[PDB]
Amino acid sequence: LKLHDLRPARGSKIARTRVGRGDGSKGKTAGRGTKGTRARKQVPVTF
RNA sequence: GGGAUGAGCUGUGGGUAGGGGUGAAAGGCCAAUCAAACUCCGUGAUAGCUGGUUCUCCCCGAAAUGCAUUUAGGUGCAGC
Ligand SMILES: [Mg+2]
Ligand SMILES: [Mg+2]
Ligand SMILES: [Mg+2]
Ligand SMILES: [Mg+2]
Ligand SMILES: [Mg+2]
Ligand SMILES: [Mg+2]
Ligand SMILES: [Mg+2]
Ligand SMILES: [Mg+2]
Ligand SMILES: [Mg+2]
Ligand SMILES: [Mg+2]
Ligand SMILES: [Mg+2]
Ligand SMILES: [Mg+2]
Ligand SMILES: [Mg+2]
Ligand SMILES: [Mg+2]
Ligand SMILES: [Mg+2]
């Protein structure tokens, strides 16, 4: 009863990763690090 | 300082338009930009390049080597 009693099952919802938001998380390169192709583009799988 | 009756100077009106014009020829000039004007559109062109990418704490923690490469400052697989 009482919609303020419904909650999701544990582990079903996790927070997304926000990737360009300071040093305490994926810092400034947002997990890329590099300076080459992969810093700005994707490499085709066939390559 | 040169020309200053001449292949002179100048007013008004007109014509030639972009791979086109015009040039007593310098790649010169075509509205302060010309080895191909300007504006809008394709268009948020592309850039293996340069720059930037924003709150927190806990655990772990590298690599700068091999092979291949229109390859060597890029990338694929291996290694970590
Ligand atoms: Mg910073
Ligand atoms: Mg990453
Ligand atoms: Mg890289
Ligand atoms: Mg580097
Ligand atoms: Mg950087
Ligand atoms: Mg594709
Ligand atoms: Mg004389
Ligand atoms: Mg004289
Ligand atoms: Mg006219
Ligand atoms: Mg042109
Ligand atoms: Mg010359
Ligand atoms: Mg001019
Ligand atoms: Mg051209
Ligand atoms: Mg298009
Ligand atoms: Mg440690």
CB of residue A41 closer than 7 A to nucleic acid strand B? yes
Structure tokens at A22: 């300071």
- Which positions of strand B lie within 7 Å of protein CB atoms? 47-57, 73-76
Q: What is the 3-state secondary structure (H, E, C) of chain A?
A: CCHHHCCCCCCCCCCCCCCCCCCCCCCCCCCCCCCCHHHCCCCCCCC
Solved by what technique? cryo-EM
Distance A11 CA to B16 C1' (A): 80
Residue A28: which nucleotide is closest by CA–C1'?
A: B53
Q: CB of A34 within 8 A of CB of A43?
A: no
Quote the CA–CA distance of A9 and A22 in Å, as a whole number: 31
Structure tokens at A2: 């009482």
Structure tokens at A42: 């994707």
Quote the CA–CA distance of A39 and A33 in Å, as a whole number: 7
For A18, phi then psi, to 5°, come to -105, 120
Q: CB of A31 within 8 A of CB of A19?
A: yes
